[PDB]
Amino acid sequence: MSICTSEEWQGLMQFTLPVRLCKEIELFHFDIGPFENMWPGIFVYMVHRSCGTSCFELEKLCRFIMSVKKNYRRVPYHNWKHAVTVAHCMYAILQNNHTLFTDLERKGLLIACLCHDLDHRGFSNSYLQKFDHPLAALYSTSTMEQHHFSQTVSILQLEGHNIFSTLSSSEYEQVLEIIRKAIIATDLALYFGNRKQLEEMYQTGSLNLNNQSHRDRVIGLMMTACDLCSVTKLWPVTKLTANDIYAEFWAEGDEMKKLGIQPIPMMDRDKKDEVPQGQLGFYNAVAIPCYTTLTQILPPTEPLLKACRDNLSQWEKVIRGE
Ligand SMILES: COc1cc(OC)c2nnc3c(C)nc(-c4ccccc4Cl)n3c2c1
Ligand SMILES: [Mg+2]
Ligand SMILES: [Zn+2]
């Protein structure tokens, strides 16, 4: 477990956001890319605008954010930048659906989003389950996500890091549970069943946000949408992100070879040719249906769908030579 320094969180405390960004950070298409130094501060701003300036003890919030940063690993995709990107997407969804969600949910989900990939190594659950490895022993299913939550709680248990302490014991356990379910939901394995249920519920007319089980599903699909949102950015950003994603997939393939196994095309660096086709399959089977269902449930989320559609069209162009 890694801790931030005095200079880091106090520096973050000192930070103010540039005026121009305030309007832009509100939009779904906002790309955090050009503002690396401002990422810790962008999260603070988002938390302050959604939840309130007095929602958390400022010192504790800053200690929390900077320490979270330090427990994201220097990997190609599943890193600190991804964490902030996902959180911003959540902010955009929340702001556009503000009253559908309690203060506790909004606090929980923003923190969950920032923490949802903590200590990621760049390896899949499928990998750890085949080559145990303690993490698959401790968490038989779903496996890194269980680990990410454990990491979240560990950070909260550091001195002056517990941003939820001022909540009632009831609200404290609730928010932890909101956070646990949200992080677990970012296991893409679980997404497929979840979207099908929600599709059924919305089609039939059964969907009821006052129903906790329904509610948990809706939050789940929100988690997938945020986790996938690099497919909703501008083409040149989306393109570069895909390269970081495959950089990770190929290292895992290398290990499968490096220890004698033949990996699927996706994780085989000798099969880059098949990538455009793979990304099209991913959009058609994962991303498009996800933002479709989300738009059906939360109509203000429609520009995520359109941005995803635009990027699909860009993959179709690649495939056919244009
Ligand atoms: C099998 O996992 C894939 C395959 C993709 O393209 C074919 C993927 N293509 N794009 C992805 C993005 C933006 N985010 C993810 C992702 C989501 C949850 C967990 C891990 C990742 Cl990398 N993926 C993919 C995930
Ligand atoms: Mg994850
Ligand atoms: Zn993620």
Give every CB contact of residue 151 below 8 A, 6+ residues apart in sequence: 71, 115, 118, 119
Q: Is the CB of 282 under 6 A from ligand 1?
A: yes
C-alpha 35 – ligand 1 centre gap (Å): 24
Structure determined by: X-ray
Query: 229: closest CA among 62, 113, 318, 149?
Result: 113
Read off the amino acid at residue 31: D
C-alpha 132 – ligand 3 centre gap (Å): 22
Q: Is the CB of 280 under 6 A from ligand 1?
A: no
SS3 state of residue 289: helix
| Class of residue 191 by CB neighbours under 10 A (exposed 0-12, middle 13-18, buried 19+) | buried
Q: Is the CB of 230 under 6 A from ligand 1?
A: yes
Which ranges in the chain belong to alpha helices (H)? 6-14, 19-24, 39-50, 58-70, 80-95, 103-115, 125-130, 134-138, 144-156, 169-185, 188-204, 212-227, 235-258, 275-282, 288-297, 302-319
**Among all chains, which residue has been given the structure tokens 């303690």?**
134
C-alpha distance from residue 290 to each of 37, 88, 127, 192 (Å) = 32, 18, 25, 9
**Cα 103 from Cα 90, distance rounded (Å):** 14
Distance from the first to the final alpha carbon of the chain: 48
Q: Phi/psi at 260 (nearest 5 deg)?
A: 70, 70
* Rg of the chain (C-alpha set): 19
Enter the tokens of residue 145. 């996500």
**227 marked ligand binding residue:** yes
Alpha carbon 107 to its chain's center: 15
Peptide bond just before 133 cis, omega within 30 deg: yes
Query: 246: closest CA among 263, 258, 233?
Result: 263
**Cα 61 from Cα 56, distance rounded (Å):** 6
Residue 1 is classified by DSSP as -
- Note the resolution in Å, 1 decimal: 2.0
Q: Is the CB of 224 under 6 A from ligand 1?
A: no
Domain boundaries, the chain: 1-322
Query: 276: closest CA among 228, 320, 229, 241?
Result: 320
Please tell me the CATH code under which domain 1-322 is placed.
Answer: 1.10.1300.10
103-115 vs 212-227: helix axis angle to the nearest 10?
40
Please, are residues 311 and 235 in contact by the beta-carbon 8 Å criterion? yes
**Cα 43 from Cα 110, distance rounded (Å):** 9
Q: Is the CB of 89 under 6 A from ligand 1?
A: no
C-alpha 76 – ligand 1 centre gap (Å): 13
**Cα 86 from Cα 72, distance rounded (Å):** 14
Give every CB contact of residue 167 below 8 A, 6+ residues apart in sequence: 104, 175
C-alpha distance from residue 231 to each of 17, 132, 184, 252 (Å) = 26, 32, 21, 22
**78 marked ligand binding residue:** yes
**Among all chains, which residue has been given the structure tokens 């559908």?**
100
C-alpha 78 – ligand 3 centre gap (Å): 6
**279 marked ligand binding residue:** yes
Atom from ligand 1 closest to the CA of residue 78 = 22
**Cα 142 from Cα 136, distance rounded (Å):** 8
Q: Is the CB of 188 under 6 A from ligand 1?
A: yes
116, 128, 184, 188, best to mutate for ligand 1 pocket (most atoms within 8 Å of CB): 188
**Cα 250 from Cα 41, distance rounded (Å):** 33
Please, are residues 187 and 142 in contact by the beta-carbon 8 Å criterion? yes
Please, are residues 118 and 151 in contact by the beta-carbon 8 Å criterion? yes
> Annotated catalytic sites, by residue?
78
**214 marked ligand binding residue:** no
Enter the tokens of residue 114. 């920032």
